[PDB]
Amino acid sequence: SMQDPLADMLTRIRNAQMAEKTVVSMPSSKLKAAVAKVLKDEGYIADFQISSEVKPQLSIELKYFEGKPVIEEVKRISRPGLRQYKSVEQLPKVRGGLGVSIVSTNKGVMTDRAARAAGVGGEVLCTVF
Amino acid sequence: ATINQLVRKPRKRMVDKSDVPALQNCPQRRGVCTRVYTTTPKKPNSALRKVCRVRLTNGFEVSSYIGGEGHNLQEHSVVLIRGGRVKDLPGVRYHTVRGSLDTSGVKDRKQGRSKYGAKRPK
RNA sequence: AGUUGGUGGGGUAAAGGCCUACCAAGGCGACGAUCCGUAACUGGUCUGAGAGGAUGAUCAGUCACACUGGAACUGAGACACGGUCCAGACUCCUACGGGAGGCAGCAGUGGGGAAUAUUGGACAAUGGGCGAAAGCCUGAUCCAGCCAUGCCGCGUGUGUGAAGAAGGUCUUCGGAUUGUAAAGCACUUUAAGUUGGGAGGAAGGGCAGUAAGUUAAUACCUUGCUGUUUUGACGUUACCAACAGAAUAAGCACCGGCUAACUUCGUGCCAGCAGCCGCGGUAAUACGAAGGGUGCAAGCGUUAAUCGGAAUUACUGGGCGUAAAGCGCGCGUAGGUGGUUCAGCAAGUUGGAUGUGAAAUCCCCGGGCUCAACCUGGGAACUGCAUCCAAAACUACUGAGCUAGAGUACGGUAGAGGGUGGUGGAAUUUCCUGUGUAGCGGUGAAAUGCGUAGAUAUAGGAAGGAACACCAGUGGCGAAGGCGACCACCUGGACUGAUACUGACACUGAGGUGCGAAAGCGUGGGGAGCAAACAGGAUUAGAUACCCUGGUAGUCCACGCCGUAAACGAUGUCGACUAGCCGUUGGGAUCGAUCUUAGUGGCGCAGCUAACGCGAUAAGUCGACCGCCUGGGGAGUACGGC
RNA sequence: UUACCACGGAGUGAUUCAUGACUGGGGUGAAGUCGUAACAAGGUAGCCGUAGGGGAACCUGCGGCUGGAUC
RNA sequence: AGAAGGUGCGCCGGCUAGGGUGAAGGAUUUACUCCGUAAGCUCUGGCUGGUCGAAGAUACCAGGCCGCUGCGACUGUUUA
Numbered sequence A: 001s002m003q004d005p006l007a008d009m010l011t012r013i014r015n016a017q018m019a020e021k022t023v024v025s026m027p028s029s030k031l032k033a034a035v036a037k038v039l040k041d042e043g044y045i046a047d048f049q050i051s052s053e054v055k056p057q058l059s060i061e062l063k064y065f066e067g068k069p070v071i072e073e074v075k076r077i078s079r080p081g082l083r084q085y086k087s088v089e090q091l092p093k094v095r096g097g098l099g100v101s102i103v104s105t106n107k108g109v110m111t112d113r114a115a116r117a118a119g120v121g122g123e124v125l126c127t128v129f
Numbered sequence B: 001a002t003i004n005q006l007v008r009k010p011r012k013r014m015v016d017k018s019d020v021p022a023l024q025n026c027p028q029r030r031g032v033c034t035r036v037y038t039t040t041p042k043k044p045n046s047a048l049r050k051v052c053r054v055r056l057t058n059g060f061e062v063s064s065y066i067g068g069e070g071h072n073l074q075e076h077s078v079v080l081i082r083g084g085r086v087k088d089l090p091g092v093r094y095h096t097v098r099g100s101l102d103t104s105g106v107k108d109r110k111q112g113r114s115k116y117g118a119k120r121p122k
Numbered sequence C: 001a002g003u004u005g006g007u008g009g010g011g012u013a014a015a016g017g018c019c020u021a022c023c024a025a026g027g028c029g030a031c032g033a034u035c036c037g038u039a040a041c042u043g044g045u046c047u048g049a050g051a052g053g054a055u056g057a058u059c060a061g062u063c064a065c066a067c068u069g070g071a072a073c074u075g076a077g078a079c080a081c082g083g084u085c086c087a088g089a090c091u092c093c094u095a096c097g098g099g100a101g102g103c104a105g106c107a108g109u110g111g112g113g114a115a116u117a118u119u120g121g122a123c124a125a126u127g128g129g130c131g132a133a134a135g136c137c138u139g140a141u142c143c144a145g146c147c148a149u150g151c152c153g154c155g156u157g158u159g160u161g162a163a164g165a166a167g168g169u170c171u172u173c174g175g176a177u178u179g180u181a182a183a184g185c186a187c188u189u190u191a192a193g194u195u196g197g198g199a200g201g202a203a204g205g206g207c208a209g210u211a212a213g214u215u216a217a218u219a220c221c222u223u224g225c226u227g228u229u230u231u232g233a234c235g236u237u238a239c240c241a242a243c244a245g246a247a248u249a250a251g252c253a254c255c256g257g258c259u260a261a262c263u264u265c266g267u268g269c270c271a272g273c274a275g276c277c278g279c280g281g282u283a284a285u286a287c288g289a290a291g292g293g294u295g296c297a298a299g300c301g302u303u304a305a306u307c308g309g310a311a312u313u314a315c316u317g318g319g320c321g322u323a324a325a326g327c328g329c330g331c332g333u334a335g336g337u338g339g340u341u342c343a344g345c346a347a348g349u350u351g352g353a354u355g356u357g358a359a360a361u362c363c364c365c366g367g368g369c370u371c372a373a374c375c376u377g378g379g380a381a382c383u384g385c386a387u388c389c390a391a392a393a394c395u396a397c398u399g400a401g402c403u404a405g406a407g408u409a410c411g412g413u414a415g416a417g418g419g420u421g422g423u424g425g426a427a428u429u430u431c432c433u434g435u436g437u438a439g440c441g442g443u444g445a446a447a448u449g450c451g452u453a454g455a456u457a458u459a460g461g462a463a464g465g466a467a468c469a470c471c472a473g474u475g476g477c478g479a480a481g482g483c484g485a486c487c488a489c490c491u492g493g494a495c496u497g498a499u500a501c502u503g504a505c506a507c508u509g510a511g512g513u514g515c516g517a518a519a520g521c522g523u524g525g526g527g528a529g530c531a532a533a534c535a536g537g538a539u540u541a542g543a544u545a546c547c548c549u550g551g552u553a554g555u556c557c558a559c560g561c562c563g564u565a566a567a568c569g570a571u572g573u574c575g576a577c578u579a580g581c582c583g584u585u586g587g588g589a590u591c592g593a594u595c596u597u598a599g600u601g602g603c604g605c606a607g608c609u610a611a612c613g614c615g616a617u618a619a620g621u622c623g624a625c626c627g628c629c630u631g632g633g634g635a636g637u638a639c640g641g642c
Numbered sequence D: 001u002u003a004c005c006a007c008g009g010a011g012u013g014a015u016u017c018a019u020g021a022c023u024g025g026g027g028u029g030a031a032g033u034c035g036u037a038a039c040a041a042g043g044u045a046g047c048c049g050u051a052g053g054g055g056a057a058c059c060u061g062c063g064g065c066u067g068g069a070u071c
Numbered sequence E: 001a002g003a004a005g006g007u008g009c010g011c012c013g014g015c016u017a018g019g020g021u022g023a024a025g026g027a028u029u030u031a032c033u034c035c036g037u038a039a040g041c042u043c044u045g046g047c048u049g050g051u052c053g054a055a056g057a058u059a060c061c062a063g064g065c066c067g068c069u070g071c072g073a074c075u076g077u078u079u080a
């Protein structure tokens, strides 16, 4: 019944990335917007736009580079059934730093690298590589 | 199993029962030969196997196998038994130690004669 | 039921139902009370990459106990381990009247067991009791004795030496191997043996003098220093040196694969071996020996036990279409989880500071014993808990919102959805009556059976029970089980279109609650056809079957029970995404065509799967919750509850 | 002399061990006796639930499934 | 099932709680009426002492109980 909207966002991105599409549209929220922005800063997507009119729609344009999609493995970590939190010393590494893990901290939603840069841990949302 | 299901009822370790219920956590135990007889192995094998029925200090009554070519066990012989199952004989779970109390070990044996209680020929 | 709270009082070193008299009826429990079984706890130990699993010998901290059950006294401290009293069980002394005893202190004995040691020395050192001080006591302690029980170290010689000696073994009879191995030749003396030297564990005590302080006093006394004397169980110490000689000192398991190491001779499904596969019945690299070899080595094997490998209880890190595994199906309680905006709060979360987290142990850098084991300095760690400070993304909590989830109001559509009555036509059977006469029926072929007491066929009439051809469809409706004649009455739900409304009211669901084919059970009706049981005839070696002729329960109705099915898509419910093509049942739109919903079928790209195969009606990509599985039998059985 | 109370008595229950004449199934065995139920359309297609019957595998009725061959 | 089994019980005081009847008073329907009554009489209790005997349900009165089995379901009837 959409008890996790972020998992729906990542599932939509993965499913339409596998299907060789160009734009993904979904209901938006101020958390999905932060996730989309942090992906944009990491070069995993082309662009994201938020619609107006009371029921905003968020649309994301994807990248392909070669014949294979740029995002090959995206996975949610902290679900509503588990709620995983980690400290600075325990922030997970995906592909030994070749990827990124999104972390929600009291300074906002950022990457694990920025998380150690500010020295603030938090909740591990998902891992992308 | 889901995380909530596991919280309500965690995973359980199974316990493995010992194959030697007599001699409760003991390396060896002594007993008395209530009778010495001879029996026949299972299907693919054909032989005439020597076995002694032994009553232990526990009060248990079990059957032990006598190794080697010869033996001198008879009624009311005090013996020591150790673990070890004989595959061909059904119901035989123990071995009789040669050369410990009343078994005297095999004679004219010269190779590997420490499992049969034989002194160095010298 | 002093049970839970209150008041007055008592009592204790001290709070308190700790106790007492009244007042009230409370307290605990599915976050597991009560009851049953088992067990001292921790630092730690062993395994494991870790997470975990197993476990509390030795050493250290705490607790409890002192033949069994009670009780108090003395005391700063005890309900008292070598104290008192009372009772009990069990031993013993006795002159027969009468008393004593408690090794779970150190040695020791019997017993039990597979199994665990000396009736040793000294208070020299460190501690403890008393004394003022000498000093006395101390089975604490320090040391010795025994035991390959473990960990570590060192020996059992070194170099040269080819007639490749003799012997053993194998052979193609040439030889190969044991093998530089042996012998011979030349070296060295570790350890053990004998003899001579020789520390360190030692601080102090006694005596005399001296110098300070003590007062009021050079006295006594305390303290410094000087001189002399005196102390060791271990102990024939550690250690060092000299002497003769190679002399004093290798065993155990295995050799088919897993697994490093191969051939002969005996034996012939015997004797035997074996962790698992399995060897042995006349050429056995698997049994038993011999030669050779391989692993370890003062040890080597076997047995018992824990963890690992085992991702084989899977948090990390598994599964449920067919291998084990989705409840027969709904509704719903506790619980778990929660669409989207603001604002607040700071429980979760994050960062910092402070206190604690005993020592020992494990880890790092060092220091000593000739090395190592061992001892020891410093550090790191002890991943935890607690209190303050700060942050506000997420979760939780509070206030106000919103309409994308959910629901309400209004017209229509389809339907074997359910219940109570009534009514139809075809057909079977039975009874009556007419005509008519020798067969009917059934089979693979027969027979039983029905017929001249007039059958079957044929015509008319009557009675009664049950099922509802053709429509009929990969068709429809229902949560599932299931629901087909027609009509009336009562009644649930679903599809479909627009507008308006409520404003998260949602999903799942352990327990519980209902519905639930057929067969079956109870009471009362009904009974045409069919038909378990049963009778007879066939078939057959037999035929308690298949086949034939009959035939009772049952099948039908009302009410009640029963709770099961290959109750199946062998596939839990809910939500969101992901190329296409061909049908079909309801309904909408736009112009027979195009689009769009809710079902019901056939193919198929990615993806998935062990494969078959699934593939928008997933078994694909993901979320929320629940159920279930852990080798085959025994067994969905026994016992207990309901 | 009273209060508290250990031992010890009396009555009646619960639970748990061992044992018991005699009985019911199960497993493992070897060249035994009787049949041939399943696997092919296994020679009457097999299974599932329920009822009756029979030396035994099993047969028959009622409902269900395909995890059934020919077509 | 009164299963089985157990505890108390006499007499004299102290304190204490209830019920019935019922003057005086009050009301109106003024009379064979309604409410209600101090004393007296009468019937139920509670917790606290003391005291005698060998014994307090003291006499008469007044169930014995339990465990396995056969038969008949039971209450009833029958050979004056």
Ligand SMILES: [Mg+2]
Binding pocket: B083, B084, B085
């Ligand atoms: Mg073994």
Ligand SMILES: [Mg+2]
Binding pocket: none
């Ligand atoms: Mg009280």
Ligand SMILES: [Mg+2]
Binding pocket: none
């Ligand atoms: Mg008080």
Ligand SMILES: [Mg+2]
Binding pocket: none
């Ligand atoms: Mg009080």
Ligand SMILES: [Mg+2]
Binding pocket: C032
């Ligand atoms: Mg419990």
Ligand SMILES: [Mg+2]
Binding pocket: C039
């Ligand atoms: Mg214990």
Ligand SMILES: [Mg+2]
Binding pocket: none
């Ligand atoms: Mg592991």
Ligand SMILES: [Mg+2]
Binding pocket: none
């Ligand atoms: Mg560990």
Ligand SMILES: [Mg+2]
Binding pocket: none
């Ligand atoms: Mg380790």
Ligand SMILES: [Mg+2]
Binding pocket: none
């Ligand atoms: Mg423990």
Ligand SMILES: [Mg+2]
Binding pocket: none
């Ligand atoms: Mg000890």
Ligand SMILES: [Mg+2]
Binding pocket: C061
């Ligand atoms: Mg201690």
Ligand SMILES: [Mg+2]
Binding pocket: C062
């Ligand atoms: Mg403590």
Ligand SMILES: [Mg+2]
Binding pocket: C062
């Ligand atoms: Mg202590």
Ligand SMILES: [Mg+2]
Binding pocket: C062
């Ligand atoms: Mg304590």
Ligand SMILES: [Mg+2]
Binding pocket: C064
């Ligand atoms: Mg104690």
